[PDB]
């Protein structure tokens, strides 16, 4: 047990104290971030301010060569858990929130020997949303885009593995039932400019249950 | 006396100068709840607010020591930030947990740790029926955020949530409160995932 703990600490020291440290992605060294949403609850829909509050898990996956190691050199360690604060993480942001995001869970990432990082924080988000129609059979539709705050498509590529938001954990006695929830990669082009900008558009349709 | 303090300061220094559990070095965490109050039941959002003590106990070999090497010190208190603590989490909260007490742990010479923070929690709960005699029923699961049952084994000592300190003049009368260890498996995968399911039945007083 003690030999493995020593290997884990020497590995984490080596990675976190690397000599070319990781400054985030560049055009020469771009990065792909995969995003998935697990929607748990629409807590509140406020028609006096047109804000809606979502609780979800936001799964984030990316991979760095500088987080790669050979397990044989570290006592067959294939992965470790680490506070998200100790590694680089991407700057993926809701583009139309109305309040700072509230974190509902530990912020702990899993790093694997091939350099993959997985990170799933639980969050509560308020964002711009007109709930008109929520008391009808058609329901209400709202959308929020997620993307990098400072990186174009040439530095951060954004992907989803599925366009279907995972609703298998949606709260069954929520004040609002989900009619549909999609997460779709979108490419924005601006006339002025050659590089594209990637967002993932979260579209949720819902009505009073 | 100053010798006792020098022994203890030295002991804390030695211990504080562990990466979490692994599949090779797994960890058992025992969980127990003491329910103090249901403060609030919001039927416009289906959120309920609880005040409870969350009792957490675990045991690390790297925290062991012999009293005779340290002036017969058998235990000490320390800030919970000075030691590793488990990532046990409410799975259906709607607001960040609020801590209502100091976060101080008690370490014993056999390596066992006890930590009991007081917390206010808002979580998803439909309080329909609370204005009836059958009352309302709600549930919230607690479990590790990043560890399977192979690295953190969660267990209870009893399925009874301690209600002996429940607030007698709360707006809500408590009808039952249970804390059940659940083991969950997904067909994809061999490892178990463990939660403790807190189920409270309650009604307006």
């Amino acid at each position: 047990k003690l030999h493995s703990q020593a290997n884990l600490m020497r590995l984490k020291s080596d990675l976190f104290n690397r000599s070319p440290m990781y400054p985030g992605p560049t055009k020469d060294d771009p990065l792909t971030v995969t995003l998935g949403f697990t929607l748990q609850d629409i807590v509140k829909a406020d028609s006096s301010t047109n804000e809606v509050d979502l609780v979800y898990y936001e799964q984030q996956r990316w991979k760095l060569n500088s987080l790669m190691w050979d397990p044989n050199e570290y006592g067959n360690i294939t992965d470790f858990r680490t506070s998200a604060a100790d590694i680089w993480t991407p700057d993926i942001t809701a583009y139309s929130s109305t309040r700072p995001v509230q974190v509902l869970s530990p912020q702990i990432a899993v790093v694997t020997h091939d350099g993959s990082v997985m990170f799933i924080p639980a969050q509560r988000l308020s964002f711009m949303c007109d709930p008109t129609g929520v008391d009808s059979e058609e329901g209400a539709t709202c959308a929020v885009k997620f993307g990098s705050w400072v990186y174009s498509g040439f530095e951060i590529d954004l992907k989803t593995d599925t366009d279907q938001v995972d609703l298998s954990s949606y709260y069954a006695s929520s004040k609002y039932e989900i009619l549909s929830a999609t997460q779709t990669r979108q490419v924005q082009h601006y006339s002025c400019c050659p590089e594209p900008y990637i967002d993932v558009n979260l579209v949720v349709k819902f009505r009073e249950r | 006396k100053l010798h006792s303090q020098a022994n203890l300061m030295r002991l804390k220094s030695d211990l504080f100068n562990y990466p979490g559990p692994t599949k090779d070095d797994p960890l058992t965490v025992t969980l127990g709840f003491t329910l103090q109050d249901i403060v609030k039941a919001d039927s416009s959002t289906n959120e309920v607010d609880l005040v409870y003590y969350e009792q957490q106990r675990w045991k690390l070999n790297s925290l062991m020591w012999d009293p005779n090497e340290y002036g017969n010190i058998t235990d000490f208190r320390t800030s919970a930030a000075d030691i590793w603590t488990p990532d046990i989490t409410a799975y259906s909260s709607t607001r960040p947990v609020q801590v209502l007490s100091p976060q101080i742990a008690v370490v014993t010479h056999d390596g066992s740790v006890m930590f009991i923070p007081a917390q206010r929690l808002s979580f998803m709960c439909d309080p329909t029926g609370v204005d009836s005699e059958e009352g309302a029923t709600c549930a919230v699961k607690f479990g590790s955020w990043v560890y399977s049952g192979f690295e953190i084994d969660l267990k209870t000592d009893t399925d009874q949530v301690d209600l002996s300190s429940y607030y007698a003049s709360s707006k809500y009368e408590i009808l039952s409160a249970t804390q059940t260890r659940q083991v969950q498996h997904y067909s994809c995968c061999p490892e178990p995932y463990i939660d403790v399911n807190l189920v409270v039945k309650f009604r307006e007083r």
Binding site: G36, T38, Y57, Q59, R61, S105, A109, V110, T112, S116, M118, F119, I120, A122, D161, D166, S168, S169 | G143, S144, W145, V146, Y147, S148, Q184, Y186, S187, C188, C189, E191, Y193
Partner: peptide
């Protein structure tokens, strides 16, 4: 499934 549970998801990149 496994992918709506964060401890299981972070343990199975091959699936989630």
């Amino acid at each position: 499934g496994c992918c709506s549970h964060p401890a299981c998801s972070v343990n199975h990149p091959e699936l989630c």
